Amino acid sequence: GVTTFVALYDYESRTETDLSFKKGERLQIVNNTEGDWWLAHSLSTGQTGYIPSNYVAPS
Amino acid sequence: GVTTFVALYDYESRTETDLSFKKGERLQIVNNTEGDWWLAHSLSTGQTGYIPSNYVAPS
Amino acid sequence: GVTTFVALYDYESRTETDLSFKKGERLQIVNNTEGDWWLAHSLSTGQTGYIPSNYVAPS
Amino acid sequence: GVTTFVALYDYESRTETDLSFKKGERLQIVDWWLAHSLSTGQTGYIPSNYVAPS
Ligand code: NI
Ligand code: NI
């Protein structure tokens, strides 16, 4: 199936480009080569934005 | 590092491998930016494709 | 939903790490930061491997 | 370009926080390295001393 990560914690947006999400939300990672901020697409909300990589774990 | 640009104009692309986008859409720029066309991920839609560098500026 | 690419042409695996796919196949791109070869996970077959970057377009 | 390593040993991540893998599994590398498994398509960190160039 689609490979995803799962949110370990809620995250509230603080910037124009980050992605808010709730604990347990399934996220498809689009780009994870730029250090601690990964570009993610939420499979719940359809939104796309940067996430703190330490808030997620492989599904 | 995470590099985000913003579209200055609407663009309706001419091939499926180039993104169409709207003015104000934010785009993560990936890879080598030495040409006129840059690989990008849309923060509006999550799609990936090439964009014309003259249509974007740092966000 | 899941953000995907579609194969533009058939491709037959020739190495231990590339991925076979057929024209029209829906693929997840896991990495596309390294240039001419991207890492894909097929949503049609479940297989994973490198693909030529110019063989796919956003769905 | 794409950098592929191969696992020299099995590794079972106690919690599913790092990548679990088997000996012989190939991994794209993008003490701990972020990797994509070419067997499962999963992504996670792996211990660099468990891998060698494929
Ligand atoms: Ni799968
Ligand atoms: Ni979506």
Numbering used by the authors:
A (entry chain A), B (entry chain C), C (entry chain B): 85 to 143
D (entry chain D): 85 to 114, 120 to 143
Paper text:
The SH3 domain is a small protein fold comprised of approximately 60 amino acids. SH3 domains are also identified in all eukaryotes as well as in some prokaryotes and viruses. These domains typically mediate protein-protein interactions and affect enzyme regulation, substrate binding, protein localization, and motility, regulating pathways that impact numerous cellular processes, including proliferation, migration, endocytosis, and actin cytoskeleton rearrangement. The founding SH3 domain was identified in c-Src and has been shown to play a major role in autoinhibition of its kinase activity. As our structure confirms, the c-Src SH3 domain structure consists of two antiparallel β-sheets formed by strands β1 - β2 - β5 and strands β3 - β4.
A unique crystal structure of the Src SH3 domain in the trigonal space group H32 is determined to 1.45 Å resolution. Crystals belong to space group H32 with unit cell dimensions a = b = 63.77 Å, c = 271.71 Å, α = β = 90°, γ = 120°, and four molecules per asymmetric unit. Chains A, B, and C are fully modeled from residues 85-143, while chain D lacks strong electron density for residues 115-119 (in the n-Src loop), which remain unmodelled. The two nickel sites are located at the interface of Src SH3 chains A and B in a 2:2 stoichiometry. The nickel atoms bridge the A and B chains by coordination of the nitrogen and carboxyl oxygen atoms of the N-terminal residue Gly-85 of one chain and the imidazole epsilon nitrogen atom of His-125 on β3 in the neighboring chain. Octahedral metal coordination is completed by three water molecules. We further examined the 2:2 stoichiometry interaction between the Ni2+ ions and chains A and B of the SH3 domain. These chains are related by non-crystallographic twofold rotational symmetry, and the interface buries a surface area of approximately 440 Å2 per chain. In addition to the intrachain Ni2+ coordination, the interface features hydrogen bonding between Gln-112 and Thr-87, as well as van der Waals interactions including Val-86 and Leu-127 near the nickel binding site. We thus conclude that the standard PxxP peptide binding to the SH3 domain at the xP and specificity sites is incompatible with the formation of the H32 crystal lattice since these sites in the SH3 domain are involved in crystal lattice contacts.
